[PDB]
Symmetry: D2
Subunit: 253 residues, 4 copies
């Protein structure tokens, strides 16, 4: 019986890939906090359900779904399902992503190819499947979650750096083809953010990373979410082709 005010993304259908944990989770919760219908994906039914429960728990309408962004067939079918029963996503956050770390001399075929196809080729798969939706609406937001490593580089990560740097090149190029239809395309490049993955790293390696961080701390996933939530709003209608780095000053360009 309380009726709250309409928020910046009220009514917009949003897709957020890899939403079961850390940054993707926080993005989903933030878009929902702002009124979107949120559709997050994970690689497993168990992730896909964790998502539905997290949306339900925070009062957010939407769905948790299974998407493998490395598979052509999984993308087309999940996206056809979304279109059939859920809505046409007008905000798409590509956050799905993986690392396969090794010096390039120690690097196996799979580790290279997997990272490229998961972090980079996915942007071709998701965008191609959603763009017709945005073009009819004459409105859209594609937001690709890149990484500090794209512009900085990092030993052990020629693969990741390659895929994430390509993600920003893709961002720019697509901004160029879709601006006429009032669809913006922007990249968000997190620095070192406190998550499942990064807590596994050892305390000497972490105490060192902090030394390279002017802000003297790791960021919180929420801090990525908020930036993404902004790029999705009308307030960022004039921003496109951009890369916003959210790194506490670990990297400046």
């Amino acid at each position: 019986n309380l009726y709250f005010q309409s928020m910046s993304l009220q009514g917009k259908v949003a897709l957020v890939t890899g939403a079961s944990r850390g940054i993707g989770q926080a993005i989903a919760l933030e878009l929902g906090r702002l009124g979107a219908v949120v559709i997050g994906t994970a690689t497993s039914a168990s992730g896909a359900e964790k998502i539905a429960e997290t949306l339900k728990a925070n009062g957010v309408e939407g769905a948790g779904l299974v998407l493998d962004v490395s598979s052509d067939e999984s993308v087309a079918a999940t996206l056809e399902h979304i279109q059939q029963h859920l809505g046409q996503p007008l905000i798409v956050v590509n956050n799905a992503g993986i690392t396969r770390d090794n010096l390039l001399v120690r690097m196996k075929d799979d580790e290279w190819f997997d990272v490229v196809n998961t972090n980079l080729n996915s942007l071709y798969r998701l965008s191609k499947a959603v763009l017709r939706g945005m073009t009819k609406a004459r409105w859209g937001r594609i937001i690709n979650i890149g990484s500090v490593v794209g512009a900085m580089g990092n030993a052990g990560q020629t693969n990741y750096a390659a895929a994430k740097a390509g993600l920003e090149g893709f961002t720019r190029a697509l901004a160029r083809e879709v601006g006429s239809r009032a669809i913006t395309v922007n990249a968000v490049a997190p620095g070192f953010i406190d998550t499942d993955m990064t807590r596994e790293l050892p305390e000497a390696q972490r105490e060192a990373l902090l030394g390279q961080i002017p802000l003297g701390r790791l960021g919180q996933a929420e801090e990525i979410a908020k930036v993404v939530g902004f790029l999705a709003s009308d307030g960022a209608a004039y921003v496109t082709g951009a890369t916003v780095p959210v790194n506490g000053g670990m990297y400046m360009s």
Copy 2:
């Protein structure tokens, strides 16, 4: 709202982007002190803030003068209160091909667009250091990164503002102060045959609105942007991409 409790200083806030930045931060709860070169400019700011239901004041400030800045800000810091969000927005152009450019034309642009950053920051940085919180948001231009024939002076000033932005951010990060830049493109208020030619260079195919700069600024001002620092946010409709 999100800036309630905070005092925000916005230089050059009597029209266009600056004004809109001023109304934006006021809308989010900040007490805004917007500055203008002249008394009437200053009084008009105060009329606008009240008309929009925002609290703050208009202030005469000449950001190209060591005395006007250092003294004016000593005044505010003393009797009005302490600016924790500073938007350095004031800037001039003096367009000319370098072969043609006059001495004043070069030096006035460097001094007002670049040295002012030294002036303003010097003055508010102890207040923020003490408070362990700050937002310094420098208003650049797409010309800093991109260049523009006839604007070698403006391009140096604004490009210099981004480098200042990056260095300061490293000094003050440990005190939870973010220093960030925002590079407007071609904005409506900030301005047939050459009209089209220009829109033809913008992927969104339109000029930006002053409010579209201010929204970005409001965000950088907020708690949510705490982990962004040292950055330049181009807001240029796709005109230049970096």
Copy 3:
């Protein structure tokens, strides 16, 4: 001359930029191995190299295996010496707006321009690491930093290329190997579209002309030299001013 004693491996060397890089490292006194896609193109490289008084060879390069490349490499090292200058210039375009792009247009441009950097680069690093000296120079494009409607595939591969460059730079610097990219703008080749489009394109370039393959070759030459020993993880844009950053 400035590259005497060195062996350079230059990929996609049968035409345009690749060919020019090859002639230029040759001019500078390198033993030059130019790769092509076809047996007939590799033969043609060898002849071109001979007609310009350059010691070298054509190579059709089998990048199917960790072992296939490394052996192609000891074969080179048997008859010619350990290649310590490697120029990655493989890559093609397959242009289209994303909504119209066919899958294989996307994967082909990504495979040929970006994945190609993995295989050869990994296989030469071992002899560079032993020699405590090397050059890897990756040929990218203005389109990586700038983007281009119709070229989201190209842009993403060429921009990956720069990312590759920077991070490899960080792994291999302690051994005096430099890793740098050269991002050519619009160049005079086979390709260059229609005369109507020609003039509007030049309008986009402060220098008012297309670049010559030779000009790209010269920048690559210099990056290969002892004088570029302190440049690494860099992208040098050779674009006529059409893009600056």
Copy 4:
């Protein structure tokens, strides 16, 4: 009686500021080795004389002159003197600037103004003066020696950072006004090069410096000169508005 092959810069008149030591001196010798008539300059007569020793000693045809780029009369006189005896300089290498390091809350007014003046304002008068000679000849090279600190930024160096980043901005803008006339304007951004500044260092902080450099070493002044020597040549004719960073991998963008 010995006649050597002509070099890439034969006949070309070249002006190099700050040429009495380090980077500037090396730049001057390299332009000479490449066949150029080099006029190197210093702010002081002992520096101008010392430059003339070095040119003669290394067999470069040219001159050591007193130039204060702050001053219009200095600039106008130097150039007339260069014009009467040697030719129009078609290669000008703007190499200026000192540091006056401090956190901003400590920095003194003149520490700020000296650096901006020296590092940025320095570009105005000389560049303005050589241009016309270049536009008439339809050929030219302007090369502005910046610093990694423009791009990377640095605590204690807000002044140097602002001025050198400005240097790069000036570069791109100028590049666009003169490219029609076959004049290129480029910046070179040295990293930590073996110089007076780096030698003044406490060995302790000098090593901290190496560890942030992939190459594991300081740069040689010679290594800046080579890069600049190349940008002067015909080979670099299609490069303009660029910042070539020579930093050993200390910063990558």
